Design a protein around this nucleic acid. Structure first.
Ligand SMILES: [K+]
Ligand SMILES: [Mg+2]
Ligand SMILES: [Zn+2]
Lengths: 340, 118, 618
DNA sequence: CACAGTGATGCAAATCAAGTGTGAAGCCAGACAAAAACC
DNA sequence: GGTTTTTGTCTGGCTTCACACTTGATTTGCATCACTGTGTAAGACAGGCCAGAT
DNA sequence: TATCTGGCCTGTCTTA
């Protein structure tokens, strides 16, 4: 666990809280630029590579058959196995929520320059209302694959929305969503175990189970220390989901998550209280029917991170985390990598 | 206070004499000043002359919107009390304090409040 | 004992002095004036005063003999306070001193003026919308609202770096309308219409928005805000009534660019170029505004309910901000115009023959085309097909021209031609940067000598106003050797000055009819001059505003009747008010500076308050 | 130990308004006389 | 001293005016709060570097 | 050869 300062290039102003990194074969890429795309990079997607602690963000182009998805802050992102990425929800630069879902896959990789295919996936049934700060994962049960989508926030509904509180948000109803990408349909499941709304939580998916960690419940304004197990059964008939509550969970919202090794991940970052960042780190070890959360050695944080009121970041995919804090005002943010 | 000359003491004693001689009668000022001036115009005056210094010593020691509901109620109960200003007000206030009672007077004031505003 | 002066003496002493003349005056009264000593002395004194040219004391004595209670109604104190720029703290100093020295409460204390303000601010008068506005609240007592409109600020969400206060849009309009009520009544009268007539009035609102720099942050606890501001404002431009098969103009703003009548609607400490924060704050304004298009305001004026329908014209925007909010590319792009689809190379070849095709509704279609890419095109081809609309618009603006910034840009171009004419670039193609610096230095010095202009870093309205004259071309010609080019500069400037009044005056049809008639003809020869005798600069390229000025002025004028009256110059002058008020009319604290400025800037724009200051000119 | 503001708040102090008859202050009348400044 | 002008005193009644008190509601006075701006360009000095002088 | 001053440059320090 080594912390390291990162220099940034001329277009550092793109990086904002709510950005996304995607991993395609050890090459990292960047999505969710601040502002609408400019002529320097019309897709708003960037090859994101740190060479000797220097980050150069370099524009990437789309295939002829691609959509031009708007930059999205706090979307639900997810990796799918033939490798492709799922993006659902998010805020647009105009502060609208997209109900849309986009698929990011590589189209071409000649001369170590990458062309992406961004295709829009239509969705019918019980489509989840437009959201941000929510999780989406794919599971595997009896040789069948299914997408799970939980929690998040949206604006009030048209019936009750007032220009005077036009930007007020509220946690979506905690229904678990099963989303089949092959058929383009979506089924909602209300569970008595999930009564509270929850967003900015951590989602770990192994086999046919998804773990819901931490997060913030807006109605109660509490960051739960609970853990929730959701297992999806995929038989020939109706798929069913069972929710189990497991004591000994983390209390943290907005935390990041990287996979260090098979069956283990690290949790870092995030907030314990509105004005108390979570400086501790957790190790998660996954058994077939067991999950183990254990304290691990804190990193050698600097006096900037310690006293920063906020921080943000994301997993880069190799067990390293790209971390940003608001800096001086010049360069608005200060960026660090954190290896494991 | 004031300090009085010999001629002034003279005029005062003449006014006292005239009052005792003629009680029912009202004196004219201009004529009385004339006749006092002629009577004053060497021994008679010595008494007043010595009285003036005693008065000088005396001068030394002297040197060293329509109305409130209470107002509406007050005005009506005023006639009865008169039959029975400061004492009136005290009685009015004590009885108004001892009294749903003042709801009608305040309804009248409520009607008058819009009339004052416009 | 030398006689003392008469005025020093005691009442007794002056009686003895005037005893001789007292009786002498008494005879004259009984003889000539019925024994009225009071009135014959009052008149003798008054006449003695005016004999000594001392009319003030005579006039004051006259008001004492009558029962003259001199005091100013509070709303009149408000008007004097607001419009003379006195602060409450200074006005309280004035009030206090007047009352102490005169002994009379001529000016009202602040608690009264503070109560007088209530009528003039949003949320006082009642109103109703038929049908009810969508997503807007039927409450009618809503004054200053938090401009973040409930934007999520928990440490998980996006960071909130701005502070903002606003009026609800409808609620603001009502207060504006009620402020204009006397002037709407008078306008009907002067059109020979029933005062009580209540028909469907139509209100045309001019909409302006503006970014400022150099707004220093205060010390003290709060959000670390940026040193920039954005201001959204509206101006009521004209009101007509429908009386038969006619639209009768009952109000038209006389000074359509005056800070007096640009009303503030939203102040925020934010960067206009921070799209996320700009749309978070203003989205509730454009929602309120959209709802008002589909409804009729019924509001009570003079006892009689009146209906009002509203037309919103967003024209107080400079080109940079138009492009940001209508999803267009930035002004360097090859798509040079916000009004047409022409390319900057085509604008230099054709020059004049283009018509207005862009619109808020087209741009929304085009974004969606951009986003969806329905012909599965290459980026080049996709961009060509949507003509540079690669972002989703979020504000409806009129396709127009801002006369202030147009005026400024054109002058800045002429200033560059003057430089290049001095270096004889028409004859010598290449020249070093040092060689170019000196061209500017010559021109800068000469403009100081012959025009009294000092040099400035960035071009000004007044600089533009003073540079674009034929006296200035005379000055510049002294520096250019070739008189074949004195002729070209003189003509180019003559054409320009035949053109300018069209896009600047309030009614070109009434004010420069021959200028309006000849525009298409004159703009052709202007364009031909640039292609012929200025080929060195205008071959393959032209500026945005030259294009707008040359190709769209006549159409805009017939669609709208004016260009100048819809300019941003009024909203810009409001910025000057922003700065003054932030210093000297608000609480010096981070969490009240915006609402105090908003409230007091609204007052400063009240026509009801302004009228008390034209009372001398009855 | 700079300093005169910047506007809104809210609490204390003032003011108001009504009933009517007390005393206190100034005033008038003619005439002459204290003090207090000047040859 | 003689002389000249300020201030009175003597009286009965004339007018105008402040005051007397209580109650609840307005209208004024005032201190309080955390922050504002005016302080805002260039010279002195040391230490490295290398070509042309010693 | 073997040093050696002087400009030159950059950079910090002092007051604005
Ligand atoms: K002006
Ligand atoms: Mg500006
Ligand atoms: Zn055009």
């Amino acid at each position: 666990v080594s912390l390291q300062m990162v220099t940034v290039g001329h277009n550092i102003a793109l990086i904002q809280p709510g950005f996304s990194l995607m991993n395609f074969d050890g090459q990292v890429f960047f999505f969710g630029q601040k502002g609408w795309p400019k002529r320097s990079c019309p897709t708003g997607v960037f090859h994101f590579d740190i060479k000797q602690n220097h980050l150069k963000l370099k524009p990437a182009i789309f295939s002829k058959d691609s959509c031009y998805l708007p930059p999205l802050r706090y979307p639900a992102t997810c990796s799918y196995k033939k490798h492709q990425y799922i993006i659902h929800g998010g805020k647009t630069p105009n502060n609208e929520l997209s109900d849309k879902i986009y698929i990011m896959s590589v189209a071409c990789k000649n001369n170590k320059k990458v062309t992406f295919r961004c295709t829009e996936k239509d969705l019918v049934g019980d489509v989840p209302e437009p959201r941000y700060g929510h999780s989406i994962d794919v599971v595997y049960s009896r040789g069948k694959s299914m997408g799970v989508l939980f929690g998040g926030r949206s604006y009030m509904p048209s019936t009750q929305r007032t220009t005077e509180k036009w930007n007020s948000v509220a946690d979506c109803l905690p229904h678990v969503f099963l989303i089949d990408f092959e058929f383009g349909c979506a089924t909602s499941y209300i569970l008595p175990e999930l009564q509270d709304g929850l967003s900015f939580h951590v989602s770990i998916a192994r086999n046919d189970t998804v773990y819901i960690l931490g997060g913030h419940s807006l109605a109660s304004n509490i960051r739960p220390a609970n853990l929730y197990r959701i297992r999806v059964d995929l038989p020939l008939g109706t798929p069913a989901v069972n929710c189990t509550v497991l004591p000994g969970g983390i209390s943290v919202s907005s935390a990041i998550l990287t996979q260090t090794n098979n069956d283990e991940f690290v949790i870092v970052g995030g907030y314990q209280l509105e004005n108390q960042k979570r400086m501790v780190c957790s190790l998660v070890s996954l058994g077939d029917n067991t999950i183990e959360i254990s304290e691990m050695e804190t990193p050698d944080w600097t006096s900037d991170i310690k006293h920063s009121k906020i921080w943000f970041g994301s997993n880069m995919g190799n067990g390293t985390i790209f971390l940003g804090i608001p800096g001086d005002n010049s360069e608005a943010f200060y960026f660090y990598t954190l290896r494991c | 206070r004031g300090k009085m000359s010999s001629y002034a003491f003279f005029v005062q004693t003449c006014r006292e004499e005239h009052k005792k001689k003629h009680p029912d009668a009202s004196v004219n000022f201009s004529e009385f000043s004339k006749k006092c001036s002629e009577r004053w115009k060497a021994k008679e005056k010595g008494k007043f002359e010595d009285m003036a210094k005693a008065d000088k010593a005396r001068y030394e020691r002297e040197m060293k919107r329509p109305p409130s509901a209470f107002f509406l109620f007050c005005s009506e109960y005023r006639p009865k009390i008169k039959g029975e200003i400061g004492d009136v007000a005290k009685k009015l206030g004590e009885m108004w304090n001892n009294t749903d009672d003042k709801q009608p007077y305040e309804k009248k004031a409520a009607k008058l409040k819009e009339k004052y505003e416009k | 004992r030398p006689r003392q002066h008469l005025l020093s003496l005691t009442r007794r002493a002056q009686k003895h002095r005037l005893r001789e003349l007292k009786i002498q005056v008494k005879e004259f009264a009984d003889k000539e004036e019925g024994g009225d000593v009071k009135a014959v002395c009052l008149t003798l004194f008054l006449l003695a005063l005016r004999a000594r040219n001392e009319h003030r004391q005579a006039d004051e004595l006259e008001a004492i003999m009558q029962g003259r209670g001199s005091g100013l109604q509070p709303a009149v104190c408000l008007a004097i306070r607001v419009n003379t720029f006195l602060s409450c703290s200074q006005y309280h100093k004035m009030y206090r001193t007047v009352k102490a020295i005169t002994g009379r409460q001529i000016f009202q204390p602040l608690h009264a003026l503070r109560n007088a303000e209530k009528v003039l601010l949003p949320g006082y008068h009642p109103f109703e919308w038929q049908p009810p506005l969508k997503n807007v609240s039927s409450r009618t007592d809503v004054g200053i609202i938090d401009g973040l409109s409930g934007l999520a600020s928990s440490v998980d969400e996006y960071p909130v770096d701005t502070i903002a206060k606003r009026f609800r849009y409808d609620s603001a309009l009502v207060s504006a309308l009620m402020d204009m009520e006397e002037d709407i009544l008078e306008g009907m009268r002067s059109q020979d219409l029933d005062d009580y007539l209540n028909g469907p009035f139509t209100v045309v609102v001019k909409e302006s928005c503006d970014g400022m720099g150099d707004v220093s942050e205060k010390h003290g606890s709060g959000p670390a805000v940026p040193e920039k501001a954005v201001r959204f404002s509206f101006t009521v431009m004209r009101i007509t009534i429908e009386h038969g098969s006619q639209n009768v103009k009952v109000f038209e703003e006389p000074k359509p660019n005056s800070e007096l009548c640009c009303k503030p609607l939203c102040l925020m400490l934010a960067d206009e170029s921070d799209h996320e924060t700009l749309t978070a704050i203003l989205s509730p304004l454009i929602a309120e505004r959209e709802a008002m298009k589909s409804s009729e305001l019924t509001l009570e004026m003079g006892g009689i309910p009146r209906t009002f329908k509203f037309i919103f014209r967003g024209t107080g925007y400079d080109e940079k901000l138009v492009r940001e909010v209508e999803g267009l590319e930035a002004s360097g792009s090859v798509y040079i115009c916000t009004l047409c689809d022409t390319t900057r190379l085509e604008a230099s070849q054709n020059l004049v023959f283009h018509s207005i095709t862009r619109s808020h509704a087209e741009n929304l279609q085009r974004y969606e085309v951009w986003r969806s890419n329905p012909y599965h095109e290459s980026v080049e081809e996709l961009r060509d097909r949507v003509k540079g609309v690669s972002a989703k618009p979020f504000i409806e603006t009129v396709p127009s021209i801002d006369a202030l910034h147009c005026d400024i840009g054109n002058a800045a171009e002429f200033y560059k031609i003057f430089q290049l004419e001095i270096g004889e670039v028409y004859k010598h193609p290449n020249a070093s940067k040092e060689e170019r610096k000196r061209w500017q230095a010559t021109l800068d010095k000469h403009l100081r000598k012959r025009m009294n202009l000092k040099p400035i870093m960035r071009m000004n309205g007044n600089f533009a106003r003073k540079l674009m004259t034929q006296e200035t071309v005379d000055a510049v010609c002294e520096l250019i050797p070739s008189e074949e080019r004195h002729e070209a500069l003189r003509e180019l400037m003559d054409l320009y000055l035949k053109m300018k009044p069209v896009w600047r005056s309030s009614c070109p049809a009434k004010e420069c009819p021959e200028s309006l008639c000849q525009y298409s003809f004159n703009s052709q020869r202007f364009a031909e001059l640039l292609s012929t005798k200025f080929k060195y600069r205008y071959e393959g390229k032209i500026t945005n505003y030259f294009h707008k000025t040359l190709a769209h002025v006549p159409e805009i004028i017939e669609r709208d009747g004016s260009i100048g009256a819809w300019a941003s110059e009024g909203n810009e002058s409001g910025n000057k008010l922003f700065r003054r008020f932030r210093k000297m009319n608000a609480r010096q604290s981070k969490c009240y500076e915006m609402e105090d400025v908003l409230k007091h800037h609204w007052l400063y724009t009240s026509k009801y308050l302004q009228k008390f200051m034209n009372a001398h000119n009855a």
